[PDB]
Amino acid sequence: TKKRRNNGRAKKGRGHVQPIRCTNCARCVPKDKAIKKFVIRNIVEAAAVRDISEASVFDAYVLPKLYVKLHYCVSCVIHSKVVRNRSREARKDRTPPPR
Amino acid sequence: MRAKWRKKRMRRLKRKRRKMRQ
Amino acid sequence: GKCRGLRTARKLRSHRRDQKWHDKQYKKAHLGTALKANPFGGASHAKGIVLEKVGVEAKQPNSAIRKCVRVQLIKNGKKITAFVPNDGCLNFIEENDEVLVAGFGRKGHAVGDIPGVRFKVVKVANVSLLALYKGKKERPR
Amino acid sequence: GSLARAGKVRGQTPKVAKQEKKKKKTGRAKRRMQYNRRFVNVVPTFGKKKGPNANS
Amino acid sequence: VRMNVLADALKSINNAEKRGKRQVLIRPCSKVIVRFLTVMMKHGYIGEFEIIDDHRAGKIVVNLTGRLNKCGVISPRFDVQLKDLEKWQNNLLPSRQFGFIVLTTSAGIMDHEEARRKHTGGKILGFFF
Amino acid sequence: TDPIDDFQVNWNTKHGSGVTRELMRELNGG
RNA sequence: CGGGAAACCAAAGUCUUUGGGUUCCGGGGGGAGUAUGGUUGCAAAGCUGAAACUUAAAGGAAUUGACGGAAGGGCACCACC
RNA sequence: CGCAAGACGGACCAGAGCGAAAGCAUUUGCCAAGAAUGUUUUCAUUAAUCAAGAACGAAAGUCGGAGGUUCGAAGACGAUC
RNA sequence: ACGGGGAAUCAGGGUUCGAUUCCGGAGAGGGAGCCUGAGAAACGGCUACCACAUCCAAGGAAGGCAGCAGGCGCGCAAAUUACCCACUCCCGACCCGGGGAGGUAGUGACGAAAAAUAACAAUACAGGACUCUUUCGAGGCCCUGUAAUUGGAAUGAGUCCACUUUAAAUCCUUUAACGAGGAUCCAUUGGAGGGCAAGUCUGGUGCCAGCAGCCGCGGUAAUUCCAGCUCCAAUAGCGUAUAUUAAAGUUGCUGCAGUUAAAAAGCUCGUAGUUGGAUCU
């Protein structure tokens, strides 16, 4: 029985999608099927922000951020709890989490 | 048995059989 | 879909004739291989000589010992195991005598819990097993 | 696969003779008896649909 | 490709009647389509229709009285003899009280009752009830 | 012997088939 | 609308109210894509492709429960800390 | 700080596009092709599906010749079991 | 696989069968070659060879039942070594002779038709039937029947007579004489859990023996086995094994299906095939 209408991937109107490697296990997962997270995180953690700011040579330095694109296989994305299993009805909800 | 492995075993059987038959 | 044309009779006929060979009964009854493998050779009954008495164990869900006889047919010399139907009827059969054996009722298929047996004894020594069972006739001397 | 036991139960069953009874009618008379018992006799049926061989 | 324009016309009429519409646009038109529609309309099933004349192949707008249950084509157009007509009516018609098989005969396109009146067999075009 | 009670009790036993027949007799001409 | 066993499908609809045209193709489960013959290939193998025999089911969708070294939220000194 | 090799073409990259499918992503140039759209152009049934035949056809695999970074069947070790 | 006429269900469509009495063909153990004749490659004609096979005094001679009967053999599987040309026809030199063609027959359940095994009481009963006045009470008005107390009437199965029948005859038909009261002049075959009609009554057996087409029954309270009784299905007929048809819309032309149950070729060209737009009074 068909679990998903899109077969768990985002491929329409094409035959082949180039694979990528899961950031955790290095599994070969198609780019459309893979679960992608774009993490924009401060290089300095919030606990260390004040201590780094005081030791700054320049006043008003605004610390840089980290830009890392994360690719996940289904197994590692489920294990890491980035995605969870949902009900048959809530599976269809494509809206990203409001956070 | 997994169907792929059943096919592999059958193919090895056929390889031996064609080895013995000349 | 199927073809619907005034000149499609040959296509329909040939397709039906080719697809009939994918019918189990049709292939069995028209290939002729099941006929040569049939010990009776298309006959309803056959006469054989009792080689020995054998008891075959019933299939797993129920337990019993089925009183059969291994017979050799006279027409072709083939070896046959035939069920002796009623109780005590194995005592009416002696080794090395003629028996009339029929099918078991499923056209070459095993019947009931008896494994690999598709023949049954009808007459022994030219007197029916039912007459011997009911006492209407005695075994000839 | 021992054949020693064969007809054991038909051998050890007590032999009971058939009782002598009045002969039953045949042909049209048997059918007439059936018809009278099943459609002319209404007394046994009060509407509970009992079988002809109900011994309980 | 589009073969048997009569099949398309009858399928469009049937689909529009199922949807409960009052008018259906049929294209392309043809002489056989007009004759079939006329046979339908003489029996009160379909009502008036208008043939739009574009200079290549007409279109027909057919008013739809809600009286029609099914109109169908028979493909291929089997040649039907007057002795095989009853079998066709049993196969195709809901009852012997209503429903018509439209044949095309050398006496023209008409229903099976008229074809038996004129003592003509022909080729089966379709049916309507 | 209540035909309905027999059906409710042992419809799922060795006698379920015969008990069903006796139930159908009590209800209608079955 | 409609159809399906349902899951579901604007097609998998316009189907017992059954015919637009046409190709391929299935006939309970195994034996078995096996044996054999032919044919292609250097080879690996590819294509076409049985039968004897065996079996009362195999299977599809879904429903409740049970279970999960599956997730979420709670609880208990017959649990732990 | 450079130098040299092969491999690949991230982010942009999308339920986006193209191709008959397999498949296709760095710039630029050349070569031939293509769908759709527009058309008050031309031909005027030239069409649809297709036994036989034919072209293409992931990966792995085979035979030659280069190359051989990375990964890596086989294999060699090291590991809680 | 001799062909056809034709035969086995009726929804419509079909699927099977047709050795078999009518028509056509072929053959006479297998081949081959011939004579005669209008007509034969004839075999109840001939000549060879091949395979079998008969008598022999061992020199030789004679064979052809897939004609009627009968044997053996093969087998699951099939009849009497009978009577007759009276009928139907055929043949001849023929009104006259002949015909195992054909017709007629003591044990043919292939199959088909008709059709016995019984029809009518006082009686107690479980009853009921037109306003029943009473649960203690007219019930041959209408019907059913536990019946060790009844009664007459009817008749053919059978045995015999008369020779009707027929070519001498049997048979049906006909008439007579006997022929029915457990009318002993005695109906069987398969079933009783379901499918599927009809007992979780009794005894025995104790996963044994066996039953059971299928599901299942049997492991000491078996609705299923072995039996007794009772019950029901068809009935002089029932059961079983096979082939076959319908059921099978599970071969689908009518009329199936191909996402996940079995299934659309990896893809695209392409010849044959199939199908093909409007338009003429």
Short mmCIF file of C-alpha atoms (C1' of nucleotides) in Angstrom, two decimals, chain I residues 125-246:
data_model
loop_
_atom_site.label_atom_id
_atom_site.label_comp_id
_atom_site.label_asym_id
_atom_site.label_seq_id
_atom_site.Cartn_x
_atom_site.Cartn_y
_atom_site.Cartn_z
"C1'" C I 125 -57.64 -41.84 22.08
"C1'" A I 126 -53.68 -35.45 20.79
"C1'" G I 127 -56.91 -32.99 18.30
"C1'" G I 128 -59.47 -29.31 15.91
"C1'" A I 129 -64.06 -27.75 12.35
"C1'" C I 130 -70.86 -23.24 11.50
"C1'" U I 131 -74.15 -19.27 18.02
"C1'" C I 132 -69.69 -25.57 21.37
"C1'" U I 133 -74.83 -23.34 27.46
"C1'" U I 134 -69.34 -26.01 31.50
"C1'" U I 135 -61.33 -26.80 32.58
"C1'" C I 136 -65.38 -32.28 35.42
"C1'" G I 137 -69.87 -33.15 28.90
"C1'" A I 138 -73.47 -34.74 20.88
"C1'" G I 139 -66.99 -34.82 18.04
"C1'" G I 140 -68.81 -42.15 10.75
"C1'" C I 141 -70.18 -33.05 9.82
"C1'" C I 142 -64.80 -32.84 8.11
"C1'" C I 143 -60.34 -35.14 8.70
"C1'" U I 144 -55.13 -37.98 11.20
"C1'" G I 145 -53.46 -41.96 13.20
"C1'" U I 146 -50.16 -45.53 18.92
"C1'" A I 147 -53.72 -50.49 17.60
"C1'" A I 148 -51.18 -57.96 20.92
"C1'" U I 149 -60.30 -57.13 19.76
"C1'" U I 150 -62.05 -56.01 13.60
"C1'" G I 151 -64.70 -56.60 8.72
"C1'" G I 152 -66.08 -57.53 4.19
"C1'" A I 153 -65.31 -55.81 -1.10
"C1'" A I 154 -61.29 -55.02 -5.42
"C1'" U I 155 -57.39 -56.64 -8.19
"C1'" G I 156 -53.02 -58.24 -10.57
"C1'" A I 157 -47.83 -60.65 -9.84
"C1'" G I 158 -47.95 -65.89 -10.35
"C1'" U I 159 -49.61 -71.04 -11.96
"C1'" C I 160 -52.67 -73.09 -15.86
"C1'" C I 161 -56.80 -73.71 -20.47
"C1'" A I 162 -58.48 -72.21 -24.95
"C1'" C I 163 -53.52 -71.68 -30.02
"C1'" U I 164 -55.40 -65.00 -30.79
"C1'" U I 165 -50.39 -63.85 -32.53
"C1'" U I 166 -46.47 -66.07 -36.01
"C1'" A I 167 -43.15 -68.90 -41.64
"C1'" A I 168 -44.28 -74.25 -36.37
"C1'" A I 169 -43.76 -70.48 -32.27
"C1'" U I 170 -42.67 -67.36 -27.27
"C1'" C I 171 -44.55 -61.67 -25.75
"C1'" C I 172 -48.41 -58.25 -25.54
"C1'" U I 173 -53.90 -58.43 -26.09
"C1'" U I 174 -58.54 -61.87 -24.98
"C1'" U I 175 -61.57 -65.72 -22.13
"C1'" A I 176 -61.84 -69.08 -18.49
"C1'" A I 177 -59.90 -72.19 -13.42
"C1'" C I 178 -57.06 -71.30 -8.92
"C1'" G I 179 -54.37 -67.09 -6.91
"C1'" A I 180 -54.04 -61.55 -0.59
"C1'" G I 181 -54.59 -59.88 5.97
"C1'" G I 182 -47.95 -59.82 9.40
"C1'" A I 183 -52.61 -59.04 1.99
"C1'" U I 184 -44.44 -62.88 4.75
"C1'" C I 185 -47.24 -61.90 -2.58
"C1'" C I 186 -42.40 -58.77 3.43
"C1'" A I 187 -38.31 -52.15 -1.88
"C1'" U I 188 -34.06 -50.72 -2.12
"C1'" U I 189 -29.89 -47.35 -2.33
"C1'" G I 190 -27.52 -43.65 0.05
"C1'" G I 191 -27.58 -40.30 4.25
"C1'" A I 192 -29.11 -37.72 9.56
"C1'" G I 193 -22.82 -31.22 11.91
"C1'" G I 194 -22.74 -27.60 7.71
"C1'" G I 195 -22.84 -26.95 2.33
"C1'" C I 196 -27.81 -30.15 1.92
"C1'" A I 197 -33.53 -32.82 3.66
"C1'" A I 198 -33.19 -35.38 8.03
"C1'" G I 199 -31.51 -37.16 16.13
"C1'" U I 200 -25.73 -32.58 20.59
"C1'" C I 201 -31.24 -40.21 21.31
"C1'" U I 202 -28.81 -44.99 23.41
"C1'" G I 203 -24.65 -48.61 23.61
"C1'" G I 204 -19.36 -49.57 22.08
"C1'" U I 205 -14.76 -47.35 20.66
"C1'" G I 206 -11.17 -43.51 23.07
"C1'" C I 207 -6.57 -39.18 17.62
"C1'" C I 208 -7.37 -46.32 17.81
"C1'" A I 209 -10.53 -48.38 14.44
"C1'" G I 210 -12.40 -45.52 11.06
"C1'" C I 211 -15.40 -41.24 8.84
"C1'" A I 212 -14.70 -37.19 5.94
"C1'" G I 213 -15.78 -34.79 -2.36
"C1'" C I 214 -14.55 -29.64 1.19
"C1'" C I 215 -14.72 -27.48 6.17
"C1'" G I 216 -13.91 -30.90 9.73
"C1'" C I 217 -15.24 -35.64 13.41
"C1'" G I 218 -12.40 -39.31 16.75
"C1'" G I 219 -7.18 -37.92 22.42
"C1'" U I 220 -13.60 -42.56 28.07
"C1'" A I 221 -20.31 -37.21 28.72
"C1'" A I 222 -18.28 -38.44 19.50
"C1'" U I 223 -24.89 -34.37 16.75
"C1'" U I 224 -19.74 -37.20 12.16
"C1'" C I 225 -16.66 -43.73 13.44
"C1'" C I 226 -18.98 -49.26 14.65
"C1'" A I 227 -24.16 -50.41 15.78
"C1'" G I 228 -29.77 -50.23 17.69
"C1'" C I 229 -33.96 -47.26 17.13
"C1'" U I 230 -35.99 -43.18 14.82
"C1'" C I 231 -35.83 -39.71 11.02
"C1'" C I 232 -35.49 -38.08 4.85
"C1'" A I 233 -33.89 -38.07 -0.22
"C1'" A I 234 -35.01 -40.52 -4.75
"C1'" U I 235 -37.61 -44.74 -5.75
"C1'" A I 236 -37.54 -50.29 -9.22
"C1'" G I 237 -34.20 -47.63 -8.70
"C1'" C I 238 -29.99 -45.49 -5.99
"C1'" G I 239 -24.48 -45.18 -4.91
"C1'" U I 240 -19.32 -44.88 -6.83
"C1'" A I 241 -14.98 -43.94 -10.54
"C1'" U I 242 -13.78 -41.38 -14.91
"C1'" A I 243 -14.63 -38.10 -19.67
"C1'" U I 244 -17.65 -34.02 -20.74
"C1'" U I 245 -21.46 -29.53 -20.49
"C1'" A I 246 -23.81 -25.82 -17.41
#
